[PDB]
């Protein structure tokens, strides 16, 4: 509250980690259905259907421009990446597992580089 904070968590390297992160997302095999946004000409349904569309680069953007204003708003872009994936894929199609088996390699790295 007024004048009283808890103890400063150093957040100074937080934008450096992320881009870490976000490196080893890219470059993991399964990134393909996620490098670059879905063509909503060229794909039917997904305009309508997710409102919110997002997708690695889009996220490199925002981090490289200082759209992000904390490592949490950061995170609920990654994940929303993966949200989007289960809504619009089945689970057993290549980009379904893919999508599974992303998540996964992100909430690992997430938690032993920040908990």
């Known amino acids: 509250s007024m004048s009283v904070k808890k103890p400063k968590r150093d957040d100074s390297k937080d934008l450096a ?5 976000l490196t080893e997302m890219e470059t993991h095999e399964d990134a393909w259905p996620f490098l ?14 997710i409102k919110k569309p997002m997708d690695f680069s889009t996220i490199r ?15 609920l872009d990654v994940r929303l990446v993966f949200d989007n ?14 999508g599974h088996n992303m998540r996964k ?6 938690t032993d580089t920040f908990k």
């Open 61 to 75: 953007e925002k981090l490289s421009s200082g759209q992000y204003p904390n490592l949490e708003t950061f995170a």
């Open 85 to 98: 994936c289960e809504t619009f894929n089945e689970d057993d199609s290549d980009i379904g597992r893919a």
């Open 17 to 21: 980690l992320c881009s870490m992160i």
């Open 36 to 49: 670059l946004p879905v063509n909503l000409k060229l794909v039917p349904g997904y305009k309508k259907v």
């Open 105 to 110: 390699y992100f909430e690992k790295k997430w």
